[PDB]
Amino acid sequence: MPGTIKENIIGVSYDEYRYRSVIKA
């Protein structure tokens, strides 16, 4: 949503940082 460029908490990264880095390779 434009007009609010100060709150990228609207779920941006869905599958790229969900605390799922416990199985590094």
Contact present, 1 and 10 (Cβ < 8 Å) = yes
Experimental technique: NMR
DSSP 2: T
- Distances from the Cα of 15 to the Cαs of 2, 4, 11, 19, 20, in angstroms? 23, 23, 10, 10, 9
CA 12 from centre of chain: 4
Closest-CA residue to 11 (of 23, 24, 22, 1): 1
Tokens of 2: 């434009």
Closest-CA residue to 12 (of 24, 22, 4): 4
The CA angle 18-23-25, to the nearest 5 degrees, is 120
